[PDB]
């Protein structure tokens, strides 16, 4: 069911980095990873949490639809793309933390906790501040657990409406061409050691879907582009994308 391919490690070592890629072949129900241990080690989800957060906000009516505008609060922050109005689509695209912090405050501890348990999401533990627990609280999730959660979302099997799941999958759209579609979400965890980057999602092909989840050590922001670059090299090696 699970195969370890330590040859993908070359994609990490060649960039003086360390990390794990996990792939799941939906048709064959088989998984692949370069590091079985790290594939099951639990990290802060950071901005990958915007997937479950969006689902909960939509299903409770905190977010009406993907067009609703969340006005900039007028506080200048150091990420320029955050200093503007956003909707669900652009807030996901630019990982606009302060928009999602307000979502969480309106969701509230009790409903957030129940929903993450219903999703079987990670360790389901929201201990910490309700508006930051996915950045510096007690919640943790592994790469294999990300795959399990994403598979439910793909099949509309999460315990929220089909509409909520369709909207979030639209907002996850990252890349599309004549060969594949990628729906995914990046993450960047810096407040608790070890600092890591995430990329989780899936690749839609004509006749199959490949789910993926990767994390990697991220001592500085200089390496953030390696999250996608390393993942795609693995996909290319396995002949999933040209
Ligand atoms: C080039 O990006 C930076 O330098 C930088 C610095 C500080 C923070 C972030 C950030 C914040 C949240 C999510 C992400 C991300 O990618 O998933 C990235 C980006
Ligand atoms: Cl779409």
Q: Please, what is the CATH homologous superfamily?
A: DD-peptidase/beta-lactamase superfamily
Tell me which ligands are bound: 3-(3-methoxycarbonylphenyl)benzoic acid, chloride ion
Number of domains: 1
The name of the CATH architecture is 3-Layer(aba) Sandwich
Strand content: 15-25%
Element-by-element helix/strand order: EHEEHHHHHHHHEEEEH
Summing up helix and strand content along with how strands pair, one would put the structural category as alpha+beta
The CATH topology name reads Beta-lactamase
| Biggest sheet strand line-up | 1-3-2-7-6-5-4
EC number: 3.5.2.6
Catalytic activity: a beta-lactam + H2O = a substituted beta-amino acid
Active site: 47
Organism: Klebsiella pneumoniae
What does this structure look like?
With 242 residues, the chain is of the alpha+beta class. The chain has a single domain (1-242), classed as 3-Layer(aba) Sandwich (Beta-lactamase). It contains ten helices and seven strands. It has a seven-stranded mixed beta sheet, sandwiched between helices. Helix 3 crosses helix 5 (97-107) and helix 3 runs antiparallel to helix 9 (162-171). Residues 47, 95, 186-188, 221, 224 line the site of 3-(3-methoxycarbonylphenyl)benzoic acid. The PDB classes it as hydrolase.
Q: Any descriptors?
A:
242 residues; alpha+beta; globular; binds 3-(3-methoxycarbonylphenyl)benzoic acid; binds chloride ion; Beta-lactam/transpept-like
